[model samples]
Target chain A: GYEVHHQKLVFFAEXVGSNKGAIIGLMVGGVVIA
Target chain B: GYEVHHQKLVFFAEXVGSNKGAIIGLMVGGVVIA
Candidate 1:
């Protein structure tokens, strides 16, 4: 028997305001088994 | 038989100037088979 683990999921968005513009980013992590 | 692919490796650091601060971030993507 075997096991798999999935973790670490992140996403965010932010506005700098005053025409500074916006910053956005995303990332994800996971696992697999067979 | 199987295949594994690793891609999208990135790292960076930047200064905002005038003591504004610094911006840093990193991310990675890949694949695995068994």
Candidate 2:
């Protein structure tokens, strides 16, 4: 389902925040619980 | 979480199809993914 897929994507995005030019450790901290 | 946002709502609604909405949402959606 696209809807579910989209939601998952959003959830992941929010969990990870910005991924531009950031250090590896900081990005790892944003991992989604789900 | 509120940006791509409403997609999660739709995903929950579809995944559980409104029958087990309360339970599935609380257990998986609520607990696993937040």
Candidate 3:
């Protein structure tokens, strides 16, 4: 799951740059979609 | 949370042996219990 698509590496690298000191938000759906 | 209570080390150590590469279950409780 940690393996990002090779083509997407730069995309994630950019995200990492943007994610510095980012707080991961934990969100839950209002209802069970399943 | 990473700091395991020393007194619980043996308990968790035993659990780890029983785990045998166990999958960590990610559970989320609803109803916004907090």
- The lDDT for every candidate, in the order shown, is 0.28, 0.23, 0.20
Per-residue alpha-carbon lDDT of model 3 for A1-34, expressed as tens digits?
Answer: 1221212111111112222121112222222321
DockQ score of the complex predicted as candidate 3:
0.03
For candidate 3, write residues B1-34 as lDDT tens digits.
1221112111111122222222212112332221
By summed lDDT, the worst window of 10 consecutive residues in model 3 chain B runs over: B4-13
What lDDT does model 1 reach? 0.28
lDDT tens readout by residue for model 2, B7-29: 33311112222221122221122
In terms of docking quality, how is candidate 2 classified? incorrect
Off by over 4 Å in 2: A1-3, A8-34, B1-6, B10-22, B26-34
Interface RMSD of 2: 15.8
Can you rank all candidates by lDDT, best first? 1, 2, 3
Best of the two (1, 3) by TM-score: 1
- Tell me the deviation in Å of residue A30 in model 2: 29
Residue pairs clashing, model 3: none
Chain B TM-score of candidate number 2: 0.14
Regarding TM-score, does 1 or 2 come out ahead?
1
Cα distance off (Å), candidate 2, residue A20: 43
TM-score of each: 0.18, 0.14, 0.13
